[PDB]
Design a protein around this nucleic acid. Structure first.
Ligand SMILES: [Mg+2]
Ligand SMILES: [Mg+2]
Ligand SMILES: [Mg+2]
Ligand SMILES: [Mg+2]
Ligand SMILES: [Mg+2]
Ligand SMILES: [Mg+2]
Ligand SMILES: [Mg+2]
Ligand SMILES: [Mg+2]
Ligand SMILES: [Mg+2]
Ligand SMILES: [Mg+2]
Ligand SMILES: [Mg+2]
Ligand SMILES: [Mg+2]
Ligand SMILES: [Mg+2]
Ligand SMILES: [Mg+2]
Ligand SMILES: [Mg+2]
Ligand SMILES: [Mg+2]
Ligand SMILES: [Mg+2]
Ligand SMILES: [Mg+2]
Ligand SMILES: [Mg+2]
Ligand SMILES: [Mg+2]
Ligand SMILES: [Mg+2]
Ligand SMILES: [Mg+2]
Ligand SMILES: [Mg+2]
Ligand SMILES: [Mg+2]
Ligand SMILES: [Mg+2]
Ligand SMILES: [Mg+2]
Ligand SMILES: [Mg+2]
Ligand SMILES: [Mg+2]
Ligand SMILES: [Mg+2]
Ligand SMILES: [Mg+2]
Ligand SMILES: [Mg+2]
Ligand SMILES: [Mg+2]
Ligand SMILES: [Mg+2]
Ligand SMILES: [Mg+2]
Ligand SMILES: [Mg+2]
Ligand SMILES: [Mg+2]
Lengths: 144, 129, 151, 155
RNA sequence: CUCUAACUAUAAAAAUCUCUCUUCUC
RNA sequence: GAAUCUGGUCAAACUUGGUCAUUUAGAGGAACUAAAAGUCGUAACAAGGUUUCCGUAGGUGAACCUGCGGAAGGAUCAUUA
RNA sequence: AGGGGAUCGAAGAUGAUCAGAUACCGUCGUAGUCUUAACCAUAAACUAUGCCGACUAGGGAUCGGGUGGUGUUUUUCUUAUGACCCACUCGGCACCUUACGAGAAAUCAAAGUCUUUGGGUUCUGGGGGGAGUAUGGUCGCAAGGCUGAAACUUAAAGGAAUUG
RNA sequence: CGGUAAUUCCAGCUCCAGUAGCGUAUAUUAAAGUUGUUGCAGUUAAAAAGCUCGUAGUUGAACUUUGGGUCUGGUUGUCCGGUCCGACUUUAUGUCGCGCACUGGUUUUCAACCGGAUCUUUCCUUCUGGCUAACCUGUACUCCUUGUGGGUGCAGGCGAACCAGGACUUUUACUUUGAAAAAAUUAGAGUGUUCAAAGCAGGCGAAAGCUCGAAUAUAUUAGCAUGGAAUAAUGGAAUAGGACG
RNA sequence: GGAUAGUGGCCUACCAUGGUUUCAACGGGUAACGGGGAAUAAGGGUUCGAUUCCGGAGAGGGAGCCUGAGAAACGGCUACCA
């Protein structure tokens, strides 16, 4: 049994077996192929700046019905365009179309989350300052 | 093609012991089997066995005294250092109190404690407990 | 019960008895047996045939037990061993028979299957008898050296 | 080797700064300086009475042996006056507790004082940089045949 | 501790569905 | 003994076209996801109302059907009645 | 490409049934069905169980073979056969009980001797889709095969098994 | 979760975990026996190339000196001799006790377990020379109680106690030990940085100079010497082209 | 033979046909300077090591250079491309 060779000089087949079968795992494939750098506009690094181009409201999945307020953003370090959702009650008025926004991932490792379609990112800072502080009024947008 | 003769020998031993057969028939009957069995008996884990001649490799008839729970081989005779043997202990012996991983060294086929007190290490063969 | 060229698992064989010495009842002596053996060999008889004849027509159970030595090695002693062992020779002959069949008619593709199997057996024996210094390594085998040697 | 009258190419072959005296009333053909490498190696007979030059011979040539000594198997003899030795050994990859039969082939220099066949087992030694491939040099061939010392069957 | 026998033959069409999904502790 | 300068010499570099990698627009072309109160039928899950499914080949608004070979994942493990 | 050309029968021509049936039903009827040379390389090429090994549990029966019967009918007054019954076995397809184990169970005498983890062994798969797809090869006269992704997208898909 | 009673929304209040730190995102490890060498699954869930031959790789049958007899160095625990310790309190012993708290003979039978010498038909390579280590030596035989209690001595002659000119030489892998692995980190010696992170300092005087240090292992792969000959591979002597005299 | 501090197809000249490979060559890729190490932790192990220590490498991209023991140096030069 155990159809993997066992002999005392019998692991070229074994080492190459692992060496080839690693590609089964997707994480290994992503890490070795640099897919977080060529593809996936968000360049694998935790944050990136961008410019707001337009605002959209999009519905939820089936077991919910709540039109979240997302924003089309163009990432300055590539010019590539993508959606990003803005989590809070009073945030859409804070978008200020044609502004600089600091964006991070939406915390699902390159996948949609919950009841949001086609979105992958969070809106964590707006115009230098952080939108979270604006939400609880800890600082104010200078309105430059 | 019988590849590791002692492997088959102990496999039959374990099969019958689980079944409860007070005795076992081993076909190949090589030196290594024999020495493994004097180690087996000297530790007290087996009774009196017999060798048959055939002018071809003989035969073995081992009397089971129930004290055995398992034999077992490590068919890849992994190369072991003097320090490493203890790890084999913690990976094959049911506890550190007793149990004997059998290894063949230049001195010969011996229990691991025999090797340690001889301070000599060779290659691994199997285990008994 | 290996049986490469099929799924056979039969252990039908012959088991030698315990006594490597000659049986008590036997009357003939080794030298006479050897002379009978060599005369039989000069008839042009393959060693296995001669062993069978010794077993049947006489109380010659084992060549080695009686004369202290086996048939092929004795036949080497008097410088009369054939160039090819009887085994490889008979296999080559059967291969020639297969070849003549396949040249006679074509649609025996299953006979092509037997052909490849047999020639694989020849390749195995060729490697063996090249390693053990029986044939000189120069010897090869395709179709026609068989036609010359066997015929 | 140099094959049947070494004095073949466009230049003469003379062991440097050894003088063949025409003024000696001797007719002694030539003065062939020779020397034993050492380390328990015996200079073979054919080297002392030979006529070849082989500036890169360890015995009759200019090179001096020093450093590593190895054992290997002749793998290729086609190349002229040199040789290639395969070396097969085991490599312990630690991840699997196993050894690994890999080969490394190395070129060395053979004097005409030696007869070499493919597959011969040869002791080789270290020397000066001789060629971009050759940095070792043969000493002597132990297994001259392997199994072929007896070939006939005439009892 | 003595038994081996009987047996039958329809087929006509039927297509579909947007709901709420809810909770278990001495 | 400088200038100039015979030769070669390493050769950066320039033109010229070939040749390749990568980005890169791109008339137009062909798909997939999520969106589930769009439309037509109802293919399937039971014998899904013609057993399914597979390979092959033609046709067929769509599903699919068809012919030939298969397999039970079938609805038969079963006729010395 | 060539010989055949009955029957059957994909295309098709057709008459039913139904709101729709160039579906199933029934007629005819090409390709094809037989095949000679040459391709074709796949099939649910599945026992969905790779091979070679040894060992473990009871039971009949069954095929090929051989062993021993004062075995029985055969009859060639007679043996010899054969053909049968008995007893044993070798090998082969399988089967019945069982759990002694082992499994997600359904079950399996191997799917066991596997955490008490190790007889030797080649090839495979790492959630579902996207997809056996794209792409580049490669084989091909072609139909097509072998090879073979990623982006993207989703929290289930799914296996056995439960009672309704 | 939310569709008019929200244990989740959003605030307020009660609180829970965290704490000068804590929360987010992107990568990573363990969890992961979800990469399975240790240690995966393959009748149905993912998956055994249709089957077969077959190069390379991988795997490979069993078989060739094992037992005693003796002697010893030991390292352990076995009686303890002495040294002496707790019951007895300011001080001490006979006595009871842990039946030696610190040291030996080991024939106390005991058991080992490591070698070492050895008799095995038992090689552990042996010569060519030192050097002779040494005493079968053997010369004066004697310092001496007949008595081997004890030795200078000088040609044969023990070499194995160590040296040295070769000649021999089956080789492996393996393994033990030693040599190398700078440092730094790791491990950990000691050391009151106020503790600790640390760091490699410090401690004692009487302050009159007197001292401790800066401990120790690890690294396995390549290489070198090394004790071992079980495991596994390899060579023989077949045309004797063989071994010795 | 030249040349080099000195070997060597280092370069030349005359020849010879060779060398490496499925035990992974060569090509492609490397968001790779290699290591000492770091993280992680039953054991086996996985990932990171631009970065205090070691080496090696560069001074915009290539080249060429005198001086000097030691330079192909760049806070030294000669030239082209930017
Ligand atoms: Mg319906
Ligand atoms: Mg010039
Ligand atoms: Mg409609
Ligand atoms: Mg329907
Ligand atoms: Mg119907
Ligand atoms: Mg259907
Ligand atoms: Mg036709
Ligand atoms: Mg018809
Ligand atoms: Mg109609
Ligand atoms: Mg219908
Ligand atoms: Mg029709
Ligand atoms: Mg019809
Ligand atoms: Mg298929
Ligand atoms: Mg069959
Ligand atoms: Mg997938
Ligand atoms: Mg799928
Ligand atoms: Mg293709
Ligand atoms: Mg409320
Ligand atoms: Mg809230
Ligand atoms: Mg798993
Ligand atoms: Mg499935
Ligand atoms: Mg399959
Ligand atoms: Mg198959
Ligand atoms: Mg092979
Ligand atoms: Mg063996
Ligand atoms: Mg270090
Ligand atoms: Mg520390
Ligand atoms: Mg490259
Ligand atoms: Mg790196
Ligand atoms: Mg670095
Ligand atoms: Mg550096
Ligand atoms: Mg200077
Ligand atoms: Mg420079
Ligand atoms: Mg510099
Ligand atoms: Mg500078
Ligand atoms: Mg300057």
């Amino acid at each position: 049994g155990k159809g993997k060779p066992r002999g005392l000089n019998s692991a070229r087949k074994l080492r190459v077996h692992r060496r080839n079968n690693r590609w089964a795992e997707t994480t290994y494939k992503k890490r070795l192929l640099g897919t977080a750098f060529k593809s996936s506009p968000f360049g694998g690094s935790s944050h990136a700046k961008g410019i707001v181009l337009e605002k959209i409201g999009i519905e939820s999945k089936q077991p919910n019905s709540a039109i979240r307020k997302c924003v089309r953003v163009q990432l300055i370090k590539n010019g590539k365009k993508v959606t990003a959702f803005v989590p809070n009650d009073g945030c859409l008025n804070f978008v200020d179309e044609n502004d600089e926004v600091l964006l991070a991932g939406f915390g699902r490792k390159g996948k949609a989350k919950g009841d949001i379609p086609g979105v992958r990112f969070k809106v964590v800072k707006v115009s230098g300052v952080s939108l979270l502080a604006l939400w609880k009024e800890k600082k104010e947008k200078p309105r430059s | 093609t019988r590849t590791s003769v002692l492997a088959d020998a102990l496999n039959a031993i374990n099969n019958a012991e689980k079944t409860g057969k007070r005795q076992v028939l081993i076909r190949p009957s090589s030196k290594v089997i024999i020495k493994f069995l004097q180690v087996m008996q000297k530790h007290g884990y087996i009774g009196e066995f017999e060798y048959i001649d055939d002018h071809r490799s003989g035969k073995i008839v081992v009397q089971l005294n129930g004290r055995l729970n398992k034999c077992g081989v490590i068919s890849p005779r992994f190369n072991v250092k003097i320090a490493d043997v203890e790890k084999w202990t913690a990976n094959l012996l049911p506890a550190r109190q007793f149990g004997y991983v059998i290894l063949t060294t230049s001195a010969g086929i011996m229990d691991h404690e025999e090797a340690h007190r001889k301070h000599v290490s060779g290659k691994i063969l199997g285990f008994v407990y | 019960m290996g049986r490469m060229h099929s799924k056979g698992k039969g252990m039908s064989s012959s088991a030698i008895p315990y006594s490597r010495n000659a049986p008590a009842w036997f009357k003939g002596s080794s030298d006479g047996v050897v002379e009978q053996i060599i005369k039989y060999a000069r008839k042009g008889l393959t060693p296995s045939q001669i062993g069978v004849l010794l077993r049947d027509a006489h109380g010659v159970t084992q060549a080695k037990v009686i004369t202290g030595n086996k048939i092929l090695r004795i036949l080497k002693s008097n410088g009369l061993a054939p160039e090819i062992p009887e085994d490889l020779y008979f296999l080559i002959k059967k291969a020639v028979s297969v070849r003549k069949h396949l040249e006679r008619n074509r649609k025996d593709k299953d006979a092509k299957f037997r052909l490849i199997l047999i020639e694989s057996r020849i390749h195995r024996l060729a490697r063996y008898y090249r390693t053990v210094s029986v044939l000189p390594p120069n010897w090869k085998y395709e179709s026609a050296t068989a036609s010359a040697l066997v015929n | 080797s140099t094959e049947l009258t070494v004095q073949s190419e466009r230049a003469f072959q003379k062991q440097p700064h050894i003088f063949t005296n025409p003024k000696a009333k001797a007719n002694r053909k030539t003065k062939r300086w020779y020397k034993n490498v050492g380390l328990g190696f015996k200079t073979p007979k054919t080297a002392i009475e030979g006529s070849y030059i082989d500036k890169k011979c360890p015995f009759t040539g200019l090179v001096s042996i020093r450093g590593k000594i190895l054992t290997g198997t002749v793998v290729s003899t086609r190349m002229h006056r040199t040789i290639v030795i395969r070396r097969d050994y085991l490599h312990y990859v630690p991840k699997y507790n196993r050894y690994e039969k890999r080969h490394k082939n190395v070129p060395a220099h053979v004097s005409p004082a030696f007869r070499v066949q493919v597959g011969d087992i040869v002791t080789v030694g270290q020397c000066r940089p001789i060629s971009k491939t050759v940095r070792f040099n043969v000493l002597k061939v132990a297994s001259a045949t392997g199994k072929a010392n007896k070939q006939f069957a005439k009892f």
